[PDB]
Design a protein around this ligand. Sequence first.
Ligand SMILES: N[C@@H](CCC(=O)O)C(=O)O
Ligand SMILES: N[C@@H](CCC(=O)O)C(=O)O
Ligand SMILES: N[C@@H](CCC(=O)O)C(=O)O
Ligand SMILES: N[C@@H](CCC(=O)O)C(=O)O
Lengths: 308, 308, 308, 308
Amino acid sequence: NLPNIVILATGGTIAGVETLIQAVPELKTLANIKGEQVASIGSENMTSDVLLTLSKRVNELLARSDVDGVVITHGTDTLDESPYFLNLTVKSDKPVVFVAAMRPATAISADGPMNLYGAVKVAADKNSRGRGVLVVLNDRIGSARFISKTNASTLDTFKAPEEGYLGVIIGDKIYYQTRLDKVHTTRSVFDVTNVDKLPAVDIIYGYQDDPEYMYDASIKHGVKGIVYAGMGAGSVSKRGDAGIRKAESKGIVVVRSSRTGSGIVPPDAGQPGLVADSLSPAKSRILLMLALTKTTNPAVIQDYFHAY
Amino acid sequence: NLPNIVILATGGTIAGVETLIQAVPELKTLANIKGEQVASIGSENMTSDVLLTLSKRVNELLARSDVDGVVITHGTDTLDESPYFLNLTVKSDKPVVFVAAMRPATAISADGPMNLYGAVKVAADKNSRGRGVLVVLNDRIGSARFISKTNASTLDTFKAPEEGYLGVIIGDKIYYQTRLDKVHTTRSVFDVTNVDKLPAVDIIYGYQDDPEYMYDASIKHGVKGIVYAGMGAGSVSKRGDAGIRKAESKGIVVVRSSRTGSGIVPPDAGQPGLVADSLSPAKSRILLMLALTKTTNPAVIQDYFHAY
Amino acid sequence: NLPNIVILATGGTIAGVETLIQAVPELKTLANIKGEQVASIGSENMTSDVLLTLSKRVNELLARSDVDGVVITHGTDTLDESPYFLNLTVKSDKPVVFVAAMRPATAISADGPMNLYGAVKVAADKNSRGRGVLVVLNDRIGSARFISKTNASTLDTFKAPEEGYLGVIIGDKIYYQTRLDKVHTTRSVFDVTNVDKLPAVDIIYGYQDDPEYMYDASIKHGVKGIVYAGMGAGSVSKRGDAGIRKAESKGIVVVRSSRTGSGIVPPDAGQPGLVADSLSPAKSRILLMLALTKTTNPAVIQDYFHAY
Amino acid sequence: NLPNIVILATGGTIAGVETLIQAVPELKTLANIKGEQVASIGSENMTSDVLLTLSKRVNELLARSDVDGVVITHGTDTLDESPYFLNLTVKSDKPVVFVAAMRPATAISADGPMNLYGAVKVAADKNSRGRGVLVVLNDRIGSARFISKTNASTLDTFKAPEEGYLGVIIGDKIYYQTRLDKVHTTRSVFDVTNVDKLPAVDIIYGYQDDPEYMYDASIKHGVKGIVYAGMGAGSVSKRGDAGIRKAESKGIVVVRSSRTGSGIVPPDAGQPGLVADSLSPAKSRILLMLALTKTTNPAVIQDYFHAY
Ligand SMILES: N[C@@H](CCC(=O)O)C(=O)O
Ligand SMILES: N[C@@H](CCC(=O)O)C(=O)O
Ligand SMILES: N[C@@H](CCC(=O)O)C(=O)O
Ligand SMILES: N[C@@H](CCC(=O)O)C(=O)O
């Protein structure tokens, strides 16, 4: 008997989703596959609403006994957010594997097929359980907490220079190397099963001559949180400093992230806002949205950034 | 005798400009050194008005026969913009070497002293001429066109994964490996000699649920250009698409860059705005500002992006 | 009530051991320090005989109640071997942190002082326990299983492209991100407490026109094992294939590694010898050398390569 | 009219040479293609005598007015050697492009088809001239001087951490970014046109407890050169120092390279043998072999290592 894998489609160039089984007949030797269409939009259009629907459905399917693992086909453009959202909102140790493609299915040497094969193989493997949400492309198995799209148009784009990959897929075999040393899945305190709408969170970029009016626009629309993609280690300019303090005076929680692409944004009492640890602007937004459904205490939200 | 080098201080933790020559006595074997204080601010607060002052001063010094090269002490936070600005505005083949430090001068194993030594050595080397503006940190010699701060807090933060370094400094010797295959310095058409104020350009970030009102804020303040740090290869959401087309109808030139960190944003007739080629959002802003001093024509500006 | 850390010196430019301790007075805030001279040689002359003495000395100290961790100053040249050797021979959860320096103590911006600070900082932190042998340089905390010198002369040389670092040291604070998913230290079956002399193992490189007579030389001198630093994924030429099979007929255990620098060498029934998994030629030698002290069974040794 | 490209086949899993031309019909839009079978072997079996045949054939083809460029299908295992050999022996500015595949043609998502398309596109582009020998895989255009297989089994294996790529291929467009700053092809003094057999050169690895008898083996078999894949920056042990000096006394030229994978091996008057600059053990052997057809003078050979 083979494992039971459920493929949730959200759109992307990886694909209908029912044509894939006929195009990749090697999946038959992996597991019993059942497809399901959740959404049909590009990742660039992936919204906070669809992530709620996706997460609730994942927790419902993983609760069943006739479901061993879930493979989620998604677009590459916002694969920095999606997997990490599920990494904090899934209440099961069963494998949730995100898969995508950098080349269209009709392109020469399309990466779709092999990426899909690797994703299902990971979800059907019992050793891959309890490792947090996973992302599989280019024979790599990345952690949702660290993996991000580092290049605009290459196949090997998904990397995590400072953290590497959890494991790899070579010669039709899986090789696990490291484990995520952060709070994830079953040990997470974030439960959005009842949540209907998530708090609004903007992302403002840090740069030379950065305008203060961007922060004013976020305040006008009464957003609950702001992630600052700052220069270097979350460093603020005189205009950015004024904009952040103006937001904090309105009760808005501001988290200082970095535009660099990796590294630690350290705590600093001389600067306003909380720090994003090693979380990117995109992922810092996700954690902030979920943290705002739980509390408004700066010290508690700061704890989440150093632990999740 | 030895070459004549002028150290231009603008701020940063690497520094007063008079103390710099005292802490590193090994500089005396490299060149005859003079210092000037162009500015005294943190890189996070570096502005366009100061870059105009710096570029004009550099060109005045390099035109003199008694100046062989210049070294510019600058902060790391916006070292992505400054060197590239001068890479477009400098009118001489004489080496312009930006140098910075990731650790305070008082810290244990401060990187400043060796970085400055490496920078002065590069500026005093005759073989360093006609290579564009250089950036020297951690024994590496990078191009202003490709080098960016890839990590928020590490010593080896300045990288260019797709382009590498122009050269390295090992065992008190310079090793050049590659040359910049783009337009720069003496062949550049950008001139700010008679410029008092440059056209304003903002950078808007791309992410899930990205607000269209950020573009409205840029429009209301009459910016001449907008750089979009897009999802993946500069992909726009439904809200981002509407915000861009609204900006274009007001005469605002928009260029689609990427939040990924590297790679090519390819042309696409299905999306609005121009494409940033391999230019990062920070460097795209700098090039756009200078491009807007010569023309507003989309085709001519697009050509600049594929050539500079 | 500060932790008790003992510093064991073996050699390298980072180093007597007494002169270093007082050169970094910031160590006093970390823990109580005591130094011991195990050896005084460049790492290029480090031998398996000295590793036996070092591993036993470490085990004596880690058995004591008045010792919380050990810091080992070593050279960078063979820092690929040493730490991994103790990762299999140390029988304690207490932190064993290897440290080195790429620049001499007298050089401008020497890295030693900070590297030593980080090493002691890590060895004194109770959260460092049970993570295997650690290697600390350039604000990084790498696993002895993955970390290696990737560059001949740079400060940031120690990297692990496919696995990243276990953690980083930023702003006088430790940030752990990953855990080694391999058998190490306390769970290790390798015990050299009563071993006086380790089996001899040679490393033979793979390349175009590689001679078979190198394998004949290993056989003639009676080595117990041979590590093949093969082309690509351990691919053997006509001459390498013949040499390996000739060694196997004499009882020599051969393991196929890779000259590439990273990646998996997959099992192949068409080629002779065992496979090194993701272990480098240097680390494969250390493991094979320890595996030969227990068994000569090809099946048992092959499994050591997939678990350790 | 379309350019005239000749595809030379030597072997590899990417491939009958006429079988591939039919497998990728998109090649017809690039250029007029002809195929020749130079050899049919796995790159692990590539030898210097075949390189002589290949180089001599490439030179006579490029000398023809009806040939605009050459694409060479090859295996990945020794793609570190071959391209660099031709980088020193080709007497034409016309593009010589090596291409390979990490996955067999029959595998799912085989990279072969796209790599070949990229290779032909590069060879057919007139702007590819005067850039030295090129290597095209995974949408990247690497220099024969820097590019190497950095991973045993991944598609993106071919990288050059410190130098990057000469250009990239995105959206059916070539983007040249850097140019090789070394002597190559047309300006190279190495000519093997009238060479029937090349000097024998061995590569000896550096590690803890490295045997001196490996050097004795090379001496006994009368090699003309020895490349030392040394520890760190070409560091020798007591045994390695004695072996190298012993070889030098027999008139054998020894070059100290590095097992690290990248970086500069600096000159050192305290150690024996010449230094490899930034050349890897694989590429160092190729240069030494070619240099030995012209001279045995250590100074001249050392100069080749810093220039080529
Ligand atoms: N804009 C598309 C790109 C195609 C893809 O990478 O999946 C998306 O993100 O869905
Ligand atoms: N915010 C400071 C950091 C110190 C430095 O990088 O020099 C600056 O960029 O100037
Ligand atoms: N050969 C010396 C290099 C200096 C160092 O890196 O410590 C050693 O490895 O000990
Ligand atoms: N041993 C084969 C591997 C397959 C390939 O890379 O083409 C070769 O190098 O030719």
